[PDB]
Design a protein around this motif. Structure first.
Motif, PDB file in Angstrom:
ATOM      1  N   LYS A  11      -3.837  -7.836 -26.056  1.00 32.90           N
ATOM      2  CA  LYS A  11      -3.196  -9.081 -25.814  1.00 32.90           C
ATOM      3  C   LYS A  11      -2.280  -9.613 -26.789  1.00 32.90           C
ATOM      4  CE  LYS A  11      -4.217 -13.835 -24.517  1.00 32.90           C
ATOM      5  NZ  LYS A  11      -2.859 -13.897 -24.827  1.00 32.90           N
ATOM      6  N   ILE A  12      -2.716  -9.435 -28.268  1.00 33.74           N
ATOM      7  CA  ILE A  12      -2.008  -9.915 -29.007  1.00 33.74           C
ATOM      8  C   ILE A  12      -0.770  -9.166 -29.565  1.00 33.74           C
ATOM      9  CG2 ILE A  12      -3.493  -9.419 -31.030  1.00 33.74           C
ATOM     10  CD1 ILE A  12      -0.762 -12.432 -30.501  1.00 33.74           C
ATOM     11  N   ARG A  13      -1.279  -7.641 -29.590  1.00 33.84           N
ATOM     12  CA  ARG A  13      -0.274  -6.858 -30.338  1.00 33.84           C
ATOM     13  C   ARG A  13       0.679  -6.206 -29.051  1.00 33.84           C
ATOM     14  NH1 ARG A  13      -4.821  -3.963 -33.943  1.00 33.84           N
ATOM     15  NH2 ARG A  13      -6.082  -4.536 -31.790  1.00 33.84           N
ATOM     16  N   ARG A  14       0.502  -6.088 -27.727  1.00 33.31           N
ATOM     17  CA  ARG A  14       1.388  -5.707 -26.732  1.00 33.31           C
ATOM     18  C   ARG A  14       2.682  -5.944 -26.800  1.00 33.31           C
ATOM     19  NH1 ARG A  14      -1.527  -9.295 -22.104  1.00 33.31           N
ATOM     20  NH2 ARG A  14      -0.143 -11.304 -22.403  1.00 33.31           N
ATOM     21  N   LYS A  15       3.159  -7.067 -27.695  1.00 31.36           N
ATOM     22  CA  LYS A  15       4.800  -7.188 -27.731  1.00 31.36           C
ATOM     23  C   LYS A  15       5.307  -6.521 -28.882  1.00 31.36           C
ATOM     24  CE  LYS A  15       3.293 -11.921 -27.058  1.00 31.36           C
ATOM     25  NZ  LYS A  15       1.719 -11.545 -26.941  1.00 31.36           N
ATOM     26  N   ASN A  16       4.645  -5.882 -29.689  1.00 33.61           N
ATOM     27  CA  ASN A  16       4.881  -5.104 -30.911  1.00 33.61           C
ATOM     28  C   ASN A  16       5.761  -3.687 -30.377  1.00 33.61           C
ATOM     29  OD1 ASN A  16       3.554  -7.024 -32.277  1.00 33.61           O
ATOM     30  ND2 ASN A  16       2.334  -5.513 -33.650  1.00 33.61           N
ATOM     31  N   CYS A  17       5.236  -3.033 -29.471  1.00 35.17           N
ATOM     32  CA  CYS A  17       5.949  -1.759 -29.277  1.00 35.17           C
ATOM     33  C   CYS A  17       5.943  -1.649 -27.787  1.00 35.17           C
ATOM     34  CB  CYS A  17       5.022  -0.781 -29.924  1.00 35.17           C
ATOM     35  SG  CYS A  17       5.585   0.913 -30.025  1.00 35.17           S
ATOM     36  N   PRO A  18       7.094  -2.050 -27.447  1.00 35.30           N
ATOM     37  CA  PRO A  18       7.366  -1.907 -25.814  1.00 35.30           C
ATOM     38  C   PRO A  18       7.478  -0.309 -25.670  1.00 35.30           C
ATOM     39  CG  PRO A  18       9.169  -3.147 -27.028  1.00 35.30           C
ATOM     40  CD  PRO A  18       8.025  -3.012 -27.980  1.00 35.30           C
ATOM     41  N   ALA A  19       7.820   0.635 -26.707  1.00 39.92           N
ATOM     42  CA  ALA A  19       7.698   1.813 -26.301  1.00 39.92           C
ATOM     43  C   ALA A  19       6.391   2.296 -25.754  1.00 39.92           C
ATOM     44  CB  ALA A  19       8.266   2.828 -27.349  1.00 39.92           C
ATOM     45  N   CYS A  20       5.429   2.251 -26.513  1.00 38.08           N
ATOM     46  CA  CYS A  20       3.917   2.532 -26.268  1.00 38.08           C
ATOM     47  C   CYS A  20       3.497   1.811 -25.274  1.00 38.08           C
ATOM     48  CB  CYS A  20       3.100   2.377 -27.374  1.00 38.08           C
ATOM     49  SG  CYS A  20       3.388   3.378 -28.977  1.00 38.08           S
ATOM     50  N   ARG A  21       3.977   0.458 -24.919  1.00 43.38           N
ATOM     51  CA  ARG A  21       3.428  -0.352 -23.887  1.00 43.38           C
ATOM     52  C   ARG A  21       3.675   0.240 -22.503  1.00 43.38           C
ATOM     53  NH1 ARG A  21       4.653  -6.704 -22.994  1.00 43.38           N
ATOM     54  NH2 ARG A  21       3.070  -6.892 -21.383  1.00 43.38           N
ATOM     55  N   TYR A  22       5.174   0.786 -22.451  1.00 42.31           N
ATOM     56  CA  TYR A  22       5.753   1.378 -21.129  1.00 42.31           C
ATOM     57  C   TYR A  22       5.107   2.588 -21.010  1.00 42.31           C
ATOM     58  CZ  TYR A  22       9.120   3.216 -17.999  1.00 42.31           C
ATOM     59  OH  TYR A  22       9.713   3.800 -16.871  1.00 42.31           O
ATOM     60  N   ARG A  23       4.758   3.390 -21.838  1.00 38.02           N
ATOM     61  CA  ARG A  23       3.980   4.632 -21.700  1.00 38.02           C
ATOM     62  C   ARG A  23       2.651   4.499 -21.310  1.00 38.02           C
ATOM     63  NH1 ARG A  23       0.534   5.974 -25.093  1.00 38.02           N
ATOM     64  NH2 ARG A  23       1.337   5.032 -26.817  1.00 38.02           N
ATOM     65  N   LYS A  24       1.972   3.399 -21.940  1.00 33.34           N
ATOM     66  CA  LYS A  24       0.546   3.064 -20.991  1.00 33.34           C
ATOM     67  C   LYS A  24       0.878   2.836 -19.733  1.00 33.34           C
ATOM     68  CE  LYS A  24      -3.255   1.667 -23.057  1.00 33.34           C
ATOM     69  NZ  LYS A  24      -4.012   0.860 -23.730  1.00 33.34           N
ATOM     70  N   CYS A  25       1.656   2.182 -19.313  1.00 34.60           N
ATOM     71  CA  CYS A  25       2.177   1.859 -17.924  1.00 34.60           C
ATOM     72  C   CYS A  25       2.349   3.218 -16.815  1.00 34.60           C
ATOM     73  CB  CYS A  25       3.347   0.880 -17.668  1.00 34.60           C
ATOM     74  SG  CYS A  25       3.255  -0.733 -18.396  1.00 34.60           S
ATOM     75  N   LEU A  26       3.111   4.084 -17.547  1.00 31.32           N
ATOM     76  CA  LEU A  26       3.004   5.119 -16.551  1.00 31.32           C
ATOM     77  C   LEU A  26       1.964   6.192 -16.537  1.00 31.32           C
ATOM     78  CD1 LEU A  26       6.942   6.051 -18.308  1.00 31.32           C
ATOM     79  CD2 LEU A  26       6.187   5.545 -15.906  1.00 31.32           C
ATOM     80  N   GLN A  27       1.114   6.156 -17.903  1.00 31.37           N
ATOM     81  CA  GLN A  27      -0.149   6.959 -17.755  1.00 31.37           C
ATOM     82  C   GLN A  27      -1.186   6.179 -16.925  1.00 31.37           C
ATOM     83  OE1 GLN A  27      -0.749   6.649 -22.029  1.00 31.37           O
ATOM     84  NE2 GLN A  27      -0.088   8.703 -22.492  1.00 31.37           N
ATOM     85  N   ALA A  28      -1.206   5.087 -16.828  1.00 30.75           N
ATOM     86  CA  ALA A  28      -1.957   4.212 -15.644  1.00 30.75           C
ATOM     87  C   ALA A  28      -1.213   4.581 -14.397  1.00 30.75           C
ATOM     88  CB  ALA A  28      -2.004   2.688 -16.259  1.00 30.75           C
ATOM     89  N   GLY A  29      -0.119   4.909 -14.172  1.00 29.55           N
ATOM     90  CA  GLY A  29       0.057   5.354 -12.884  1.00 29.55           C
ATOM     91  C   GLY A  29       0.998   4.262 -12.166  1.00 29.55           C
ATOM     92  N   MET A  30       1.523   3.102 -12.871  1.00 31.38           N
ATOM     93  CA  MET A  30       2.273   2.160 -12.494  1.00 31.38           C
ATOM     94  C   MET A  30       3.558   2.655 -11.752  1.00 31.38           C
ATOM     95  SD  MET A  30       1.743  -1.042 -14.905  1.00 31.38           S
ATOM     96  CE  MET A  30       2.810  -2.278 -13.952  1.00 31.38           C
ATOM     97  N   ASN A  31       4.151   2.470 -10.608  1.00 30.56           N
ATOM     98  CA  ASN A  31       5.295   2.981  -9.947  1.00 30.56           C
ATOM     99  C   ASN A  31       5.878   1.672  -8.857  1.00 30.56           C
ATOM    100  OD1 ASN A  31       4.887   4.003  -6.956  1.00 30.56           O
ATOM    101  ND2 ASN A  31       2.952   4.086  -8.195  1.00 30.56           N
ATOM    102  N   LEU A  32       6.975   1.839  -8.671  1.00 31.64           N
ATOM    103  CA  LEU A  32       7.723   0.782  -7.962  1.00 31.64           C
ATOM    104  C   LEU A  32       7.473   0.876  -6.349  1.00 31.64           C
ATOM    105  CD1 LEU A  32      10.884  -0.763  -8.974  1.00 31.64           C
ATOM    106  CD2 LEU A  32       8.558  -1.174  -9.587  1.00 31.64           C
ATOM    107  N   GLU A  33       7.193   2.129  -5.930  1.00 32.46           N
ATOM    108  CA  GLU A  33       7.076   2.401  -4.664  1.00 32.46           C
ATOM    109  C   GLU A  33       5.703   1.628  -3.828  1.00 32.46           C
ATOM    110  OE1 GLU A  33       5.414   6.511  -5.042  1.00 32.46           O
ATOM    111  OE2 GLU A  33       3.560   6.242  -4.149  1.00 32.46           O
ATOM    112  N   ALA A  34       4.934   1.217  -4.735  1.00 30.11           N
ATOM    113  CA  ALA A  34       3.926   0.185  -4.354  1.00 30.11           C
ATOM    114  C   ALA A  34       3.215   0.582  -2.897  1.00 30.11           C
ATOM    115  CB  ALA A  34       4.371  -1.144  -4.285  1.00 30.11           C
ATOM    116  N   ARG A  35       3.102  -0.306  -1.914  1.00 23.95           N
ATOM    117  CA  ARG A  35       2.843  -0.021  -0.587  1.00 23.95           C
ATOM    118  C   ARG A  35       1.525   0.755  -0.361  1.00 23.95           C
ATOM    119  NH1 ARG A  35       4.362   4.337   2.815  1.00 23.95           N
ATOM    120  NH2 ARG A  35       4.791   2.801   4.640  1.00 23.95           N
TER     121      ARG A  35
END
Ligand code: ZN
Ligand code: ZN
Ligand code: ZN
Ligand code: ZN
Lengths: 75, 73
Positions: free
Chosen positions: A51-75
């Motif tokens: 929560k405090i450090r997530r602003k530091n590294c957009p690159a690692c944050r976005y990679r964690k998003c993909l690893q978790a499986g986020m995607n726009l297709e939703a539904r």
DNA sequence: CCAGAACAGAGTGTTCTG
DNA sequence: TCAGAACACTCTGTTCTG
């Protein structure tokens, strides 16, 4: 039962883009996929994302998003 | 070209006692007079360059200090 | 309940002044 | 000479709307 964001470990808002996530990560991810996500890690690409450090590294944050499986297709 | 001793960007001149760029100039002021304890998400070893300087205020601030920046001199 | 827009606030970096 | 104010822009995160 209070449930946790699979990306930063903050308390989750609900299911967003397919993954249990907080609101900030929900919109961070939307922003990253719609735009240019060329981000540079200043570290070793293992940066701690919470929560405090997530602003530091957009690159690692976005990679964690993909690893978790986020995607726009939703539904 | 003489280069910023902190981020390696092209240096504008001598600031707060150290040869540095202007973004580093104002970052340091802001850091020093504002609170703060910044926290690294890394190893306290972050790369600081023109692009990457925005990533880790902790490591940026540290590098400023270890370079000898201070408000007095 | 969730996606997206809107709103408002924090952070960086420039240009300008004397 | 360089410090500072102020401006302009980008980023984050919360509330609102459909
Ligand atoms: Zn999150
Ligand atoms: Zn990283
Ligand atoms: Zn610099
Ligand atoms: Zn760091």
């Amino acid at each position: 039962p209070p449930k946790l964001c699979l990306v930063c470990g903050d308390e989750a808002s609900g299911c967003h883009y397919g993954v249990l996530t907080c609101g900030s990560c929900k919109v961070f991810f939307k922003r990253a996929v719609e735009g240019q996500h060329n981000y540079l890690c200043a570290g070793r690409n293992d940066c701690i994302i919470d929560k405090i450090r997530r602003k530091n590294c957009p690159a690692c944050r976005y990679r964690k998003c993909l690893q978790a499986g986020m995607n726009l297709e939703a539904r």
